[PDB]
Amino acid sequence: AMKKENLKILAKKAQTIAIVGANYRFATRVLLENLDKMDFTGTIYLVNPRYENIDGVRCYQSLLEIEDTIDVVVGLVNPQLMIQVASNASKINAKVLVIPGGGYGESGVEGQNIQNAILERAADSGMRIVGPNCMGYLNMHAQFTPYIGTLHRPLRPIKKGPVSIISQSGSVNDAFIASKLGISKIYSTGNEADVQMHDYLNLLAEDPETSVIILYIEAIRNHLSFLRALDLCSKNKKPVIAIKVGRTIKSAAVANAHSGALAGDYEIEKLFLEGHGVLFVEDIDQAVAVALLLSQPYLPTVNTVAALTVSGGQAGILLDLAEDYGVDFPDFSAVTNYEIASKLPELGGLSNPLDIWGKSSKDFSEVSNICLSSIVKDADIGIITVAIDAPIGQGDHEFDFTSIPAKDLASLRGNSDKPFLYFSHIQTEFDPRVESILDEAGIAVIQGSRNALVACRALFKYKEFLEKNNHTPIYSVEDLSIQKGLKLLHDNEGRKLLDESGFVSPREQVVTSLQEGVDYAESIGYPVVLKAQGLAHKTDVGGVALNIKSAAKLKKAWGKMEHLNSPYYLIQEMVTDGFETILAYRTDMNYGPVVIFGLGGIYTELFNEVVLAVPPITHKKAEQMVKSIPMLWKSIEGYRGNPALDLEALTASIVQMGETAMEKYEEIVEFEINPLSVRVKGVVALDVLASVK
Amino acid sequence: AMKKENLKILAKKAQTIAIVGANYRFATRVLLENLDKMDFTGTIYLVNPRYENIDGVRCYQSLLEIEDTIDVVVGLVNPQLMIQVASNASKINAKVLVIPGGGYGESGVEGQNIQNAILERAADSGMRIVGPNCMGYLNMHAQFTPYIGTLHRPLRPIKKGPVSIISQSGSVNDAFIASKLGISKIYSTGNEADVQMHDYLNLLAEDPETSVIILYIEAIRNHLSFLRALDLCSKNKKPVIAIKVGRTIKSAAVANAHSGALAGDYEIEKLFLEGHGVLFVEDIDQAVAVALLLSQPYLPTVNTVAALTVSGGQAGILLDLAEDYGVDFPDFSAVTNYEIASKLPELGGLSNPLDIWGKSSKDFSEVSNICLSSIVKDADIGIITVAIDAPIGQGDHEFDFTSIPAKDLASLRGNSDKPFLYFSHIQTEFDPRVESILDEAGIAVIQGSRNALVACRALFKYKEFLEKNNHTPIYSVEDLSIQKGLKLLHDNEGRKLLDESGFVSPREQVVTSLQEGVDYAESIGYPVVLKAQGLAHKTDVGGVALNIKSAAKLKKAWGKMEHLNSPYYLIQEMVTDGFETILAYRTDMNYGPVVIFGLGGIYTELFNEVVLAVPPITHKKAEQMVKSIPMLWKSIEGYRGNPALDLEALTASIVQMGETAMEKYEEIVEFEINPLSVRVKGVVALDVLASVK
Ligand SMILES: Nc1ncnc2c1ncn2[C@@H]1O[C@H](COP(=O)(O)OP(=O)(O)OP(=O)(O)O)[C@@H](O)[C@H]1O
Ligand SMILES: Nc1ncnc2c1ncn2[C@@H]1O[C@H](COP(=O)(O)OP(=O)(O)OP(=O)(O)O)[C@@H](O)[C@H]1O
């Protein structure tokens, strides 16, 4: 017996709970109130040597006094007192001690020590510690709510359901709770002194009561276990949604490569976690919207949406937003628009979103049923939606007509596999009478165009991830140095790496003295290129003489570069013309190698346009990377009467950068080709730069 | 007392309303309920030849039998019969006939005839027509609701306030009515057969019961009149907020110059409308949020925001969002930091947003009061916000807690001039107990961070419009050529403009035969040219040579250009290096000249980076335009060792383009320089394009 068995109770039905420090203050009162109103069937014990009884319930003098097996202890005494609570809870083999209060490892040195002593006393029996400094947790299916916050809400009650949430915030849970989400479990993680996000996530992965997971992430502590927890989730086919706080936080660290400034730590992490299936959103509203749509067991087979409205204006605005969010509302198929213009010749030209109100003499009922019957079967439409404002408090007349397409959606639900969604353009709360109808038929309901669009976008991304089947590999970071400094590699070594990886370098050689430079240059032709050496950025200090015709200009350009006390110089051909890109990889401290590719050259950081990819990179993927940058791609096709460049050579070079990255990331943490010149034939590595540490 | 005086009743108290075609159906019933429930104090008359009474209220057989002065008629009978109603209503000098039924000017040509027949019979007495084909209108301050739609909402009434709305979309009004806006008047424009948007807007401009205006725009019809109404609103210091549909719609109209593609009609219109004070937003939620904040009589003096929260995670998400929306949250002043350090040193270093929860042993009530009292007086902070989720149904303890900063805001409201706002991070419904505290104190309340940020940004924009007090002139499009076919100007006339406008081309001369060219070329020296004339877009068809180093290479090039049968050939000196910009103007069929400026060259449309300005352009305006394009601006300063370019000449160029546009817009509808080369000294137009007719 040990910590592993005890962990399991967090996702299960507890038979008994003891509340230590039970008194007349909010934590106790709300604990008892929650267990009452949420219909806990187990036994509650109160422990406090200061009181005879509370609410008529006996207050025990000690956990040791209780004649029963205790599953879960919630400790409410002060931090100093809590050490002995842990010790007594351990003595009786409590499976879990929940410590909602703060003033621990997250409050300073003294409190870190208290926290350590607690862990040490729990280690004895393997009792788990939840928190400290958190709201606790709740389990709607077990009716067990060791949770410090008011759960009972006559007005807007919590609804039980398939969505579970792990949150590193002790302040956003009521926000999730106040949403329309059907909740199963919510874990507030706190200091994660013992039970961490990956632990809760492992539980959720295999919890039959959860089909959808939401994470609210402030900071991942144990990257490897987290990644493995994510993998357990996809293994179990449970979508995982995340909000990650600190998205725009600089990260001030090292970097010799332009790649450093072009790929933020955040975007690197995002790319890796998406590789493992994470569906990122930006805020709670969006998390909710995505989860509400994913809570229905329907997925799209094609990345397109139909919207049926009763407003021209709103249809117009939705269409504009669809472009902003990159959601495809395509024309209806030729069968569909014939099927409709055949029974409703009075609608005319069909747009998507499609306004179907006041366009016919027929009952709106009939117009609606016709359109949705056809649109539902349309092979070019992945998701079927109705976009209609049906605000709370609307009149009966307004209900009669807004409920009509809901009823239709409900009537077609049993005979389609397509995701259905009724959403309102506006954010305001839905009329419950319309929601009742879609809730009864298992149709998703979302408030707000932007959220519905994010939701749809997220469905698609989820579908793609299921299709990949071959997800992102976990890279070991064990060999990686912990030093926080960077050492620039000698240009020689740089060149050696280009070679060994098959990258083509311009004909070049390193000269020691001026005559040698003239002698070498006069043995290759002009123009050549003269570059100072030992620098990360040569151009800035005038260490790059280009287009130097004749040995006359050569000796002069060398004359102007003497102040840069340059050890050896390098001369190369003047690689004529070719589109400038940047191709590199960096070593992420937690995740491993990542490849960076995009608009390159001296102005690379000003273009600020790249794409990332975790190796290995498939040939298909490299091609998609190229085509995903307009100015890059349109240039390869040959822009405005210009020769088409060597796509296939560029593609291969990207793949190759991927394999080198996999090979050398633990030792070389920066490897960059700026610019990698793309030409009619071949691609040329004009420059190279590598860093270590 | 024709048209003019009758129109004013739309904004005032009506004593009598006659409903023609009254029956037991929804339109009559909802009208009567609306007037009952909004407390209409005037007299209602029912008119219908079929009924002797309706629910025992006398039903007159004819308008003509009512022995009272009738102010407003609502016609509910079918279009055909409506002509007879119009004749009757005009005969008794009714001020307004409201037609919300459909089947008129928008239905068919038949409907069109009925409509003009109705206008015909109204002109007899100057009777105004609302609609047809709309829901009517509502004026909360006169308790008058000739409105076809349920306004009665016993549990969440429409609240009377200072915001008024003109919408070209019926189906949208109830979206607004369901919002938290304090409403004055709402006008639904319908077919705008007689009374149009600008008409409603003029009423609102001088309506003392309106202090904030929202427009939901589908298509401006009378541009001059619209602009003038805008200017009346401006004169009366009433902010105008607008949603304008069609933001993403194509318009491949006009256009020989790249400007056509860089500055689409929608962006052009937007710039002009903003010049007249319009505050654009993207959707209904945003319009609501902006109007809520403007409904309080406080404007900021510096363009910054402070936010106080009880969540570190939501603080963090708010910060991230503030970056996306471009809203400044600066550190607090030295005075604020010092002061709070002196009182709550345990808080440590203050960040903004400031999480004030669980940082102190002090009562939250004391912490909150100290922090807000200090932050309200902080000269570096323009807008004071509390950002706290307080959703409906939250517990008694959660209310007690989330209401604390609301009461503090309420208490400090009296002695600050700064805008105050309490917003939730999430979109969902506020706890009405918290909202009430803010409502009673005249403090803005918004739901959702995005809305909050858009509102703050709009406040800054409005305050800036107020400061310039030197607005966009109205340009006449009177003598503006009314053709639709765009004719390219010959390169001949192009270069003439350059000179007349003071632009300076490269050394250049026109030539006809190769010899004439090889001569001239040798006369000015190489490298040079070569460019075909009378063509596109020459470079697309290989009509531009470049870098021709000898008489040999010239003839080579001149021979490749053979097959494009050019009548003329332009020879110019090869203008060395320097930054490529595009500088132009275009004539907008409705608004007049606009200047386009940005990243130029062959890749101009791919860059898609320009800024627009309506002339006259001040020298300082031109500066901003330049510094607003990072790539351009950084190079002007001198990027990475490269020398600084001539800002003054660039700046002066843009001023000049604005002047040329003012002079020549009614004849030359496109004048474009691509590229305008920015050099170390001076600027040089390498190319020219123009169009007329
Ligand atoms: N062999 C070459 N042929 C033609 N052009 C070259 C050649 N080498 C360098 N250049 C040009 O000089 C520019 C800068 O060269 P290089 O990258 O070596 O210097 P740098 O200061 O180290 O640049 P960075 O650090 O921005 O990558 C290149 O972007 C390219 O335009
Ligand atoms: N006199 C010159 N000196 C140096 N470069 C030049 C000169 N004239 C043109 N160019 C180069 O050739 C490019 C195209 O020339 P130009 O604008 O005259 O033809 P174009 O096809 O009409 O271009 P566009 O349609 O984009 O305006 C310019 O953007 C510039 O880079």
Side-chain angles (χ1 to χ4, degrees):
Chain A
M2 197 50 191
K3 66 150 57 174
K4 154 161 50 214
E5 190 65 7
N6 291 338
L7 190 74
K8 297 189 209 168
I9 196 78
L10 296 169
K12 259 69 178 302
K13 205 171 175 188
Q15 280 299 332
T16 57
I17 174 170
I19 303 169
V20 178
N23 62 20
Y24 300 101
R25 237 74 147 58
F26 169 67
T28 297
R29 170 178 68 257
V30 85
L31 273 168
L32 298 178
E33 174 182 330
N34 288 336
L35 294 166
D36 178 24
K37 303 298 190 169
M38 299 295 101
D39 295 305
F40 180 58
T41 63
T43 305
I44 303 167
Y45 295 107
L46 306 185
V47 169
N48 195 336
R50 304 181 49 168
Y51 303 114
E52 295 317 76
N53 44 82
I54 297 166
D55 291 339
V57 183
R58 173 180 171 184
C59 250
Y60 286 78
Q61 288 168 16
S62 176
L63 282 168
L64 309 180
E65 205 180 30
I66 297 172
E67 297 190 318
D68 201 350
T69 291
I70 298 307
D71 290 345
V72 177
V73 179
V74 177
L76 310 177
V77 302
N78 73 41
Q80 274 188 304
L81 296 172
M82 189 71 56
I83 293 136
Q84 277 308 295
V85 172
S87 174
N88 291 319
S90 196
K91 286 167 202 293
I92 65 165
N93 300 90
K95 304 168 186 68
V96 185
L97 167 57
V98 178
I99 311 182
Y104 293 93
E106 85 306 325
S107 80
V109 161
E110 175 206 13
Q112 182 75 51
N113 289 328
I114 288 177
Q115 176 166 300
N116 288 325
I118 283 166
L119 286 170
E120 166 73 3
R121 266 148 188 88
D124 223 41
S125 61
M127 180 175 70
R128 298 312 213 120
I129 300 296
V130 163
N133 188 33
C134 69
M135 288 183 111
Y137 67 93
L138 74 262
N139 184 338
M140 297 295 299
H141 288 90
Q143 285 111 334
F144 182 58
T145 69
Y147 181 91
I148 311 313
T150 311
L151 293 174
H152 174 53
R153 303 143 132 271
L155 327 193
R156 180 139 328 159
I158 296 193
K159 115 142 75 180
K160 179 165 78 176
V163 179
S164 286
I165 303 171
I166 297 163
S167 151
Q168 294 180 319
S169 193
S171 47
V172 308
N173 298 305
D174 212 20
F176 282 113
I177 292 174
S179 78
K180 302 280 187 179
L181 288 180
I183 303 308
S184 180
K185 302 180 185 52
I186 300 183
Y187 300 107
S188 170
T189 72
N191 302 351
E192 301 192 12
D194 177 36
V195 179
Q196 301 191 333
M197 186 167 38
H198 62 95
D199 296 303
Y200 293 104
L201 181 56
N202 279 330
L203 292 176
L204 288 187
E206 307 196 88
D207 169 23
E209 290 159 343
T210 302
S211 68
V212 184
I213 298 151
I214 302 178
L215 312 169
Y216 190 104
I217 304 175
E218 315 244 17
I220 305 150
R221 336 184 75 85
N222 192 337
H223 290 84
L224 171 59
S225 298
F226 186 65
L227 287 176
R228 291 199 181 114
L230 261 3
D231 289 336
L232 186 47
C233 290
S234 47
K235 181 123 300 180
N236 277 269
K237 298 156 72 174
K238 288 168 184 196
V240 170
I241 299 155
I243 303 168
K244 180 140 157 31
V245 183
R247 170 160 54 80
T248 69
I249 304 312
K250 322 69 176 166
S251 169
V254 298
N256 283 318
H258 298 279
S259 289
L262 289 152
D265 280 14
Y266 184 93
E267 308 94 69
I268 290 162
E269 184 157 46
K270 173 178 185 178
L271 171 73
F272 270 95
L273 299 177
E274 295 190 316
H276 297 262
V278 175
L279 304 171
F280 285 99
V281 295
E282 282 177 354
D283 55 51
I284 295 175
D285 290 333
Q286 294 188 353
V288 165
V290 174
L292 287 168
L293 189 48
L294 279 172
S295 289
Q296 307 302 332
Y298 303 98
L299 286 167
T301 75
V302 62
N303 300 359
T304 79
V305 184
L308 202 125
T309 75
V310 301
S311 162
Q314 300 297 66
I317 298 166
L318 174 58
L319 184 64
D320 294 326
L321 299 174
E323 202 200 272
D324 307 328
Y325 288 86
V327 175
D328 191 341
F329 283 75
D331 282 312
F332 297 111
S333 75
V335 52
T336 288
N337 62 18
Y338 180 86
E339 191 166 340
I340 285 172
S342 77
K343 307 153 205 166
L344 303 172
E346 66 275 22
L347 266 54
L350 305 193
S351 275
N352 179 16
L354 177 71
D355 175 26
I356 61 151
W357 176 265
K359 307 270 261 255
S360 156
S361 71
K362 309 187 173 60
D363 289 10
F364 176 59
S365 224
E366 190 179 334
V367 171
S368 183
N369 188 281
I370 284 174
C371 295
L372 286 178
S373 294
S374 160
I375 293 170
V376 161
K377 301 156 32 198
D378 183 317
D380 301 348
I381 295 312
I383 298 157
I384 310 306
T385 80
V386 166
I388 288 181
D389 300 316
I392 179 153
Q394 67 180 358
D396 297 339
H397 187 264
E398 292 76 5
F399 165 78
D400 294 335
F401 96 101
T402 57
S403 73
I404 267 160
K407 275 147 54 175
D408 287 338
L409 285 182
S411 272
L412 296 165
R413 174 69 292 179
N415 216 68
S416 182
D417 58 309
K418 294 187 197 209
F420 290 0
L421 175 68
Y422 191 117
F423 69 99
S424 62
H425 301 270
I426 66 187
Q427 81 193 310
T428 113
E429 216 219 317
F430 240 84
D431 176 356
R433 301 145 60 186
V434 181
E435 204 166 32
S436 194
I437 298 167
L438 307 137
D439 287 351
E440 296 321 68
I443 308 238
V445 188
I446 286 175
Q447 297 145 221
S449 289
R450 303 169 184 282
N451 291 145
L453 290 173
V454 168
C456 293
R457 186 166 68 189
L459 252 212
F460 296 149
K461 181 179 254 293
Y462 187 55
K463 196 60 212 62
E464 291 181 10
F465 172 78
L466 288 177
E467 288 176 356
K468 247 210 307 168
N469 202 37
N470 55 88
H471 314 326
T472 306
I474 301 176
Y475 287 97
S476 180
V477 124
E478 301 260 53
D479 300 47
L480 189 49
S481 170
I482 47 70
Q483 218 223 27
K484 295 291 180 137
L486 275 201
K487 167 193 278 289
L488 197 57
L489 248 40
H490 286 113
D491 300 273
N492 281 161
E493 180 63 36
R495 272 174 234 111
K496 170 111 58 60
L497 302 174
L498 270 190
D499 255 280
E500 308 197 350
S501 296
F503 287 103
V504 173
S505 230
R507 293 177 318 110
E508 67 191 359
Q509 109 161 52
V510 36
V511 307
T512 311
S513 36
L514 176 46
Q515 189 59 34
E516 204 181 356
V518 196
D519 281 339
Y520 174 85
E522 283 287 351
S523 70
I524 297 196
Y526 299 74
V528 298
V529 179
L530 172 54
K531 301 166 145 191
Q533 300 278 293
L535 304 172
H537 310 125
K538 327 174 199 73
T539 291
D540 305 78
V541 292
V544 175
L546 308 152
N547 198 32
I548 86 285
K549 322 156 189 164
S550 76
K553 306 285 195 182
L554 171 59
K555 182 228 72 281
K556 187 178 76 161
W558 180 303
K560 292 180 57 54
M561 279 181 37
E562 274 174 357
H563 63 277
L564 299 326
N565 209 80
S566 184
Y568 49 95
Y569 288 63
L570 175 94
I571 296 96
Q572 24 180 251
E573 359 173 34
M574 247 294 292
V575 172
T576 80
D577 322 323
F579 194 87
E580 288 187 321
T581 61
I582 179 172
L583 182 55
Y585 90 74
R586 278 168 60 216
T587 301
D588 184 272
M589 181 184 60
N590 301 320
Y591 295 105
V594 58
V595 166
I596 299 104
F597 173 79
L599 302 192
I602 163 227
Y603 283 90
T604 184
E605 296 186 28
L606 291 179
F607 280 109
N608 191 26
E609 199 153 3
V610 296
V611 297
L612 315 175
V614 172
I617 307 184
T618 74
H619 167 91
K620 175 184 284 286
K621 174 56 178 173
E623 212 172 79
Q624 294 160 346
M625 285 165 83
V626 180
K627 299 183 191 180
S628 67
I629 306 175
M631 176 190 301
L632 197 145
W633 172 236
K634 296 196 116 61
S635 275
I636 274 106
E637 298 186 302
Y639 190 59
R640 299 188 67 186
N642 283 65
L645 310 178
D646 196 339
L647 180 165
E648 183 63 62
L650 175 52
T651 283
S653 55
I654 295 177
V655 171
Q656 178 57 229
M657 183 59 75
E659 294 199 83
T660 298
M662 286 177 66
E663 260 188 282
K664 320 225 82 183
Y665 77 95
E666 308 193 90
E667 310 302 313
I668 298 170
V669 295
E670 296 189 315
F671 186 59
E672 162 173 292
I673 302 173
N674 186 64
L676 167 76
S677 174
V678 195
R679 310 214 275 172
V680 175
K681 185 59 63 190
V683 296
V684 185
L686 305 193
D687 192 26
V688 62
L689 177 153
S691 299
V692 81
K693 260 181 174 159
Chain B
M2 217 218 332
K3 280 187 173 186
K4 315 292 301 166
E5 259 291 323
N6 288 339
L7 198 64
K8 301 167 179 180
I9 202 46
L10 290 182
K12 267 154 294 300
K13 193 199 191 53
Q15 346 243 211
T16 55
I17 176 177
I19 306 160
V20 176
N23 57 26
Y24 289 88
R25 285 277 155 114
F26 163 74
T28 303
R29 267 173 31 242
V30 74
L31 267 167
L32 295 174
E33 179 170 79
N34 284 346
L35 298 156
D36 175 33
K37 300 308 189 184
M38 302 300 109
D39 299 338
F40 180 51
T41 64
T43 305
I44 307 166
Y45 292 111
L46 310 175
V47 170
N48 199 329
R50 146 69 191 115
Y51 307 95
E52 161 219 324
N53 70 87
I54 290 154
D55 272 323
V57 186
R58 167 174 193 189
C59 192
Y60 294 74
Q61 307 294 98
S62 162
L63 265 177
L64 302 190
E65 303 180 325
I66 301 164
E67 287 172 3
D68 199 346
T69 301
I70 297 315
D71 284 334
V72 175
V73 176
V74 171
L76 295 181
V77 302
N78 54 39
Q80 267 197 314
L81 284 152
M82 190 65 63
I83 300 143
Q84 182 182 158
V85 169
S87 149
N88 292 2
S90 178
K91 183 171 197 185
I92 60 175
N93 308 288
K95 309 179 175 55
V96 170
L97 171 55
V98 177
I99 310 166
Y104 296 88
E106 84 303 333
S107 183
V109 102
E110 158 125 63
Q112 191 64 255
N113 299 339
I114 296 174
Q115 177 159 303
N116 295 102
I118 288 169
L119 292 174
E120 218 189 344
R121 288 176 177 59
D124 201 65
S125 65
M127 190 178 58
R128 291 309 213 126
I129 307 280
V130 166
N133 185 38
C134 62
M135 296 187 168
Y137 69 93
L138 85 78
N139 175 2
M140 296 292 296
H141 293 274
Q143 293 100 25
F144 184 61
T145 58
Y147 193 79
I148 306 306
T150 321
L151 296 177
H152 179 44
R153 299 155 190 251
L155 288 178
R156 69 161 57 211
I158 309 170
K159 65 154 104 176
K160 192 176 69 180
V163 181
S164 290
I165 297 160
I166 308 172
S167 180
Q168 296 188 299
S169 150
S171 36
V172 116
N173 292 330
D174 204 358
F176 282 117
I177 291 177
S179 78
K180 285 298 180 36
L181 284 175
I183 301 295
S184 185
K185 296 163 189 66
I186 298 183
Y187 296 112
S188 171
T189 75
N191 296 3
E192 286 187 30
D194 175 44
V195 183
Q196 316 178 97
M197 175 146 20
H198 58 97
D199 290 317
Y200 292 106
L201 189 55
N202 286 324
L203 288 170
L204 300 186
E206 304 188 283
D207 169 20
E209 300 165 335
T210 294
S211 84
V212 172
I213 300 168
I214 296 169
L215 313 175
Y216 190 112
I217 303 173
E218 304 226 43
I220 303 166
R221 209 266 163 250
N222 190 330
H223 293 80
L224 188 51
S225 294
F226 186 60
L227 287 180
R228 287 174 177 162
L230 256 3
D231 291 329
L232 193 49
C233 292
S234 170
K235 177 167 160 63
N236 286 273
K237 295 169 66 58
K238 298 182 169 185
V240 176
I241 304 150
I243 296 172
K244 187 157 174 286
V245 195
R247 176 164 48 79
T248 70
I249 287 177
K250 80 307 147 187
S251 188
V254 242
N256 273 319
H258 299 276
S259 299
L262 300 161
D265 298 337
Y266 185 103
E267 306 92 286
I268 295 300
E269 187 149 44
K270 187 169 179 224
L271 174 59
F272 273 91
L273 291 185
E274 294 180 315
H276 296 270
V278 172
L279 304 168
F280 290 92
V281 293
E282 286 180 351
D283 59 55
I284 287 165
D285 291 335
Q286 287 182 359
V288 167
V290 166
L292 290 168
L293 186 52
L294 284 168
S295 288
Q296 306 305 330
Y298 304 97
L299 287 167
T301 59
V302 55
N303 290 10
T304 55
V305 188
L308 194 141
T309 78
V310 296
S311 176
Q314 300 285 75
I317 287 174
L318 177 56
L319 188 57
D320 293 325
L321 290 177
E323 184 184 87
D324 309 353
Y325 287 86
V327 174
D328 188 18
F329 286 79
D331 300 324
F332 301 107
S333 65
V335 169
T336 299
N337 300 137
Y338 195 98
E339 183 182 13
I340 293 179
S342 255
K343 292 164 168 189
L344 306 166
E346 76 267 23
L347 244 53
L350 308 187
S351 63
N352 175 13
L354 180 61
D355 177 15
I356 62 154
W357 185 222
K359 305 291 173 192
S360 179
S361 200
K362 311 259 209 317
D363 294 357
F364 184 57
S365 148
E366 175 172 344
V367 178
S368 178
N369 201 259
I370 281 159
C371 286
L372 278 161
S373 296
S374 173
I375 290 167
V376 168
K377 304 179 317 178
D378 183 308
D380 299 351
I381 303 305
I383 300 183
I384 317 283
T385 81
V386 164
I388 293 175
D389 293 318
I392 183 151
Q394 68 182 346
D396 299 339
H397 184 265
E398 291 78 3
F399 164 75
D400 275 358
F401 170 68
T402 57
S403 76
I404 278 169
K407 291 174 184 214
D408 281 343
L409 285 185
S411 287
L412 297 152
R413 180 67 283 177
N415 220 69
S416 168
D417 81 89
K418 297 177 179 183
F420 280 17
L421 168 68
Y422 187 124
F423 64 99
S424 56
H425 300 267
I426 59 176
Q427 79 179 98
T428 46
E429 173 110 355
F430 240 80
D431 180 357
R433 305 181 65 199
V434 176
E435 184 157 33
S436 165
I437 293 165
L438 307 149
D439 290 338
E440 297 286 302
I443 291 163
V445 179
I446 285 161
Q447 301 152 64
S449 289
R450 300 171 183 286
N451 295 313
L453 289 165
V454 167
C456 286
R457 189 170 67 191
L459 246 207
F460 297 146
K461 189 157 238 307
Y462 185 60
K463 170 261 221 188
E464 257 117 271
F465 174 73
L466 287 181
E467 282 177 1
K468 78 170 172 162
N469 197 47
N470 162 19
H471 308 153
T472 309
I474 306 185
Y475 286 96
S476 168
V477 289
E478 221 119 313
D479 313 328
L480 171 273
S481 342
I482 50 183
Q483 320 283 211
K484 196 191 294 75
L486 201 74
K487 200 217 64 182
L488 192 57
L489 224 48
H490 215 159
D491 305 89
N492 175 16
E493 314 189 34
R495 308 178 218 99
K496 194 39 59 201
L497 294 151
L498 280 187
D499 295 323
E500 294 173 356
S501 297
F503 276 97
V504 183
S505 322
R507 179 150 207 198
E508 63 185 17
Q509 191 181 287
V510 167
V511 295
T512 330
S513 195
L514 219 198
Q515 193 67 233
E516 196 193 341
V518 173
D519 277 22
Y520 170 80
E522 216 118 275
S523 170
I524 67 178
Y526 299 84
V528 284
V529 261
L530 205 218
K531 307 203 275 211
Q533 296 296 263
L535 230 221
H537 317 162
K538 340 170 195 70
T539 198
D540 295 273
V541 299
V544 170
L546 300 187
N547 206 24
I548 300 166
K549 319 206 106 153
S550 73
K553 301 245 93 181
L554 175 46
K555 297 176 261 71
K556 217 281 195 70
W558 181 302
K560 272 163 150 62
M561 269 172 50
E562 65 161 44
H563 65 243
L564 337 155
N565 326 98
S566 199
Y568 268 40
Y569 283 90
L570 181 81
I571 288 174
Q572 63 189 194
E573 51 163 347
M574 185 68 183
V575 172
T576 337
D577 51 24
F579 199 91
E580 293 188 332
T581 74
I582 188 178
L583 177 56
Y585 88 72
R586 296 215 312 135
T587 299
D588 181 273
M589 156 192 45
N590 282 309
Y591 300 97
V594 54
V595 168
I596 297 92
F597 169 79
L599 295 178
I602 17 66
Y603 286 80
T604 199
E605 303 193 1
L606 293 186
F607 279 118
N608 205 24
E609 230 154 299
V610 293
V611 289
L612 316 175
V614 180
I617 297 154
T618 177
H619 184 277
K620 279 41 186 181
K621 174 54 176 177
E623 282 251 344
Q624 288 159 348
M625 289 166 79
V626 179
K627 293 187 224 187
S628 84
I629 312 187
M631 171 141 272
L632 166 56
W633 170 242
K634 290 279 186 54
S635 301
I636 295 290
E637 287 181 324
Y639 196 49
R640 309 181 58 186
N642 295 6
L645 312 175
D646 187 341
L647 175 61
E648 276 350 295
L650 178 48
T651 294
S653 305
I654 297 156
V655 166
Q656 174 64 55
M657 184 57 74
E659 277 167 356
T660 297
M662 304 196 61
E663 294 179 34
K664 317 207 77 174
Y665 78 88
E666 291 185 280
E667 206 211 316
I668 300 195
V669 301
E670 292 188 319
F671 176 37
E672 166 172 283
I673 301 173
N674 185 53
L676 181 74
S677 185
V678 185
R679 328 210 60 237
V680 163
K681 163 76 178 292
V683 300
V684 179
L686 305 200
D687 192 22
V688 213
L689 189 154
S691 301
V692 297
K693 166 145 299 186

